[PDB]
Amino acid sequence: LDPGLQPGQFSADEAGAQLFAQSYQSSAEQVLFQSVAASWAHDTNITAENARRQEEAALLSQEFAEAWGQKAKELYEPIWQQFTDPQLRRIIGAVRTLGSANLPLAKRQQYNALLSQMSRIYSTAKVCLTATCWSLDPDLTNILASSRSYAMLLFAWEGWHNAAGIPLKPLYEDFTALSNEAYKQDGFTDTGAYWRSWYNSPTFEDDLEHLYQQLEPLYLNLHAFVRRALHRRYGDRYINLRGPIPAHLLGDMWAQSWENIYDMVVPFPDKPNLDVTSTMLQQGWQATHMFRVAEEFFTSLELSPMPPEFWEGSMLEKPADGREVVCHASAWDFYNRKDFRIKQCTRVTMDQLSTVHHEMGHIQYYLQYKDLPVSLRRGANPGFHEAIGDVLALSVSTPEHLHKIGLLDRVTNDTESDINYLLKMALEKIAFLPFGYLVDQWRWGVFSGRTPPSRYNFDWWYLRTKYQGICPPVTRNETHFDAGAKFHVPNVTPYIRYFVSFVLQFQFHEALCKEAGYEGPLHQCDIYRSTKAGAKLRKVLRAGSSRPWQEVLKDMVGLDALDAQPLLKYFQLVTQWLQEQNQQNGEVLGWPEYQWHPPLPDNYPEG
Ligand SMILES: *[C@@H]1O[C@H](CO[C@@H]2O[C@@H](C)[C@@H](O)[C@@H](O)[C@@H]2O)[C@@H](O[C@@H]2O[C@H](CO)[C@@H](O[C@@H]3O[C@H](CO)[C@@H](O)[C@H](O)[C@@H]3O)[C@H](O)[C@H]2NC(C)=O)[C@H](O)[C@H]1NC(C)=O
Ligand SMILES: CC(=O)N[C@@H](CC(=O)O)C(=O)NC[C@H](CC1(C(=O)N[C@@H](Cc2ccc(O)cc2)C(=O)O)CCCC1)C(=O)O
Ligand SMILES: *[C@@H]1O[C@H](CO)[C@@H](O[C@@H]2O[C@H](CO)[C@@H](O)[C@H](O)[C@H]2NC(C)=O)[C@H](O)[C@H]1NC(C)=O
Ligand SMILES: *[C@@H]1O[C@H](CO[C@@H]2O[C@@H](C)[C@@H](O)[C@@H](O)[C@@H]2O)[C@@H](O)[C@H](O)[C@H]1NC(C)=O
Ligand SMILES: [Cl-]
Ligand SMILES: [Mg+2]
Ligand SMILES: [Zn+2]
């Protein structure tokens, strides 16, 4: 380990602590860069060596956090909570939380090594038919999004969940135990309590539950409307109009957003096709076009363009050489104020264009706070980081903006078109809310011990049925580990940030649309080229995590807390139209036949 990274001696008061933080931030950048660098080398090129090197960097990060956490505890443990500087209090409190650095060396290794193997299992798992084999991205993704054959969707869903989940379960149990051991020594009951602490809100869970209560009626009506369409397509044998929807029919491996079945549920298919994918292909869009168009939206707001290091270093397409990569999209900050990259196996589709904006939102954030000290190089909270790119994508997806960028012949500003659009947006945003809420409900119960290995799948499907109103299309038992077939579980990425951001982004949109001078319906707003909006947004991004998110938020939108009303205001028209459609069809809202599962196809898996 480098002496130049080990902590110096500082006076045991706030003045010495202010110098202590500078020296910490100084050396942390070198440590963070070598960790990010090695993760990148592995994720863009999965090999045992790159895994080894990634784990060495992880160990080194842990030695660094140990030394500096120790020093901080011996110097300021009794006095840092009383400092006047609140940003210093933030920094110090962070440094004294050692996480996996609380582990002994032998368990530090095992922990670092589980992450490598869980990541490899997920990102290299394949579904084989009988020579060739399908990967999740693009093969199974495209099947789930476009196939309307019940048996083919089933084969892809079952094959994926079996291939990814079953091998992960034994590893995930070991990881959970080690993670908990680590964070207990920081004073957390369990890792989940640490994750939740990032929101600095004593009533976090209660506040989330109250939000979900306001949003659930919207989901239930969307659910019932979509269920009716699936009933017509697949028959009474496979769809129960009073039961949960089979989990493989909603356009997505995790049933988590439904925009890919828009063409099965669009009420007015004569009107312009608001899925512009066919046009993007007809026009010959490529990955680089998509990132350049996203970039230009950011620069239209007088935010920063992507630096040369981004274009030279990013991986914007799935490699064609015989290489295995983590295709799950990600945005990378190397903590050197120079290098920022996206790794995305970009496909030419409309929902990938949204993803491009999402990931570039992360980069923009990185660029706007790169001069802050490291500990503040985060979103106000993790939900803020996830909302930035999605907010811009709300403007991009409006039919008026799509027209501006040549992807849609201008649509009539009528009601059939307004409903078509808000419905597509509901499929993308409202359908996600139960899933965004339930994933960390599951993981919080695993970390707390409420959900032992013996109930991993039982409790996962309890939650999936409770919240999303779906059911597995084949029988599952505790040999299956269906939570593990979702990227964020083996890759240990928390999820509640996405529930937070799916609500928050509509608060941001409203603030920015009002600040842009817009006045029509909130869902037709396009903040493109509004430099006033760009300024309001730029203030948030530069704040990093220096001020409480409740303060940053108050400055931007007028409230200091999450609020569903902007979301509700955005969807008002289709919320009403959906209720009417379901009443006219005599739908039951919900899934009272909660035990119901569909039958197998006759010749399955044959033919
Ligand atoms: C599309 O058309 C709407 C008109 O609203 C329509 O309502 C239904 C009957 C259907 O025809 C729908 O297809 C359609 O949405 C336009 O919305 C209207 O825009 C004007 C000016 O932009 C708004 O005036 C403002 O109103 C606010 C709120 O009162 C005031 O604070 C302002 O001072 C200003 O006077 C008007 O309110 C707004 N109406 C509604 C219901 O939102 C929309 O602009 C138009 N868009 C496009 C792209 O053509
Ligand atoms: C080095 C590193 O890991 N960096 C972090 C960022 C950071 O911490 O700075 C990061 O890049 N994480 C990747 C993750 C990828 C995506 C994701 O997983 N999304 C959720 C939920 C969702 C769905 C629709 C949507 O519009 C928005 C969110 C899912 O698909 O299930 C996949 C495409 C979209 C975002 C991400 O960017 O959030
Ligand atoms: C993926 O990583 C491997 C290492 O695991 C790289 O293989 C090394 O490549 C260099 C340069 O060609 C050689 O000097 C080493 O001997 C190789 N080591 C091994 C273990 O193969 C490989 O080049 C990387 N692939 C890409 C596309 O970057
Ligand atoms: C768990 O489930 C595994 C999968 O096999 C079966 O597949 C469907 C078609 C039904 O037959 C259902 O009984 C099973 O899900 C089994 O191999 C395994 O034996 C089951 N039990 C355990 C303890 O893993
Ligand atoms: Cl989070
Ligand atoms: Mg999709
Ligand atoms: Zn994100």
PDB file of C-alpha atoms and ligand atoms in Angstrom, residues 45 47 49-50 53 321 323, ligand 3:
ATOM      1  CA  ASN A  45     -14.046  -7.679 -21.379  1.00  0.00           C
ATOM      2  CA  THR A  47     -12.090 -12.634 -18.111  1.00  0.00           C
ATOM      3  CA  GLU A  49      -7.560 -11.964 -15.230  1.00  0.00           C
ATOM      4  CA  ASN A  50      -9.692  -8.836 -15.414  1.00  0.00           C
ATOM      5  CA  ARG A  53      -7.263  -7.229 -11.265  1.00  0.00           C
ATOM      6  CA  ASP A 321     -15.107  -9.781 -31.818  1.00  0.00           C
ATOM      7  CA  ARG A 323     -15.736 -11.029 -26.539  1.00  0.00           C
TER       8      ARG A 323
HETATM    9  C1  LIG B   3      -9.390  -8.785 -22.701  1.00  0.00           C
HETATM   10  O1  LIG B   3      -8.566  -9.030 -21.574  1.00  0.00           O
HETATM   11  C2  LIG B   3      -7.527  -9.982 -21.828  1.00  0.00           C
HETATM   12  C3  LIG B   3      -6.854 -10.253 -20.501  1.00  0.00           C
HETATM   13  O2  LIG B   3      -7.666 -11.072 -19.670  1.00  0.00           O
HETATM   14  C4  LIG B   3      -6.579  -9.430 -22.887  1.00  0.00           C
HETATM   15  O3  LIG B   3      -5.615 -10.429 -23.197  1.00  0.00           O
HETATM   16  C5  LIG B   3      -4.285  -9.889 -23.119  1.00  0.00           C
HETATM   17  O4  LIG B   3      -3.941  -9.133 -24.281  1.00  0.00           O
HETATM   18  C6  LIG B   3      -2.613  -8.590 -24.249  1.00  0.00           C
HETATM   19  C7  LIG B   3      -2.453  -7.764 -25.503  1.00  0.00           C
HETATM   20  O5  LIG B   3      -2.987  -8.439 -26.635  1.00  0.00           O
HETATM   21  C8  LIG B   3      -1.589  -9.717 -24.146  1.00  0.00           C
HETATM   22  O6  LIG B   3      -0.284  -9.158 -24.027  1.00  0.00           O
HETATM   23  C9  LIG B   3      -1.890 -10.599 -22.942  1.00  0.00           C
HETATM   24  O7  LIG B   3      -1.024 -11.728 -22.942  1.00  0.00           O
HETATM   25  C10 LIG B   3      -3.339 -11.077 -22.982  1.00  0.00           C
HETATM   26  N1  LIG B   3      -3.657 -11.850 -21.793  1.00  0.00           N
HETATM   27  C11 LIG B   3      -4.544 -12.851 -21.789  1.00  0.00           C
HETATM   28  C12 LIG B   3      -4.754 -13.537 -20.471  1.00  0.00           C
HETATM   29  O8  LIG B   3      -5.148 -13.190 -22.803  1.00  0.00           O
HETATM   30  C13 LIG B   3      -7.351  -9.067 -24.150  1.00  0.00           C
HETATM   31  O9  LIG B   3      -6.493  -8.373 -25.047  1.00  0.00           O
HETATM   32  C14 LIG B   3      -8.553  -8.177 -23.828  1.00  0.00           C
HETATM   33  N2  LIG B   3      -9.363  -7.972 -25.019  1.00  0.00           N
HETATM   34  C15 LIG B   3      -9.664  -6.763 -25.502  1.00  0.00           C
HETATM   35  C16 LIG B   3     -10.515  -6.745 -26.735  1.00  0.00           C
HETATM   36  O10 LIG B   3      -9.270  -5.731 -24.970  1.00  0.00           O
END
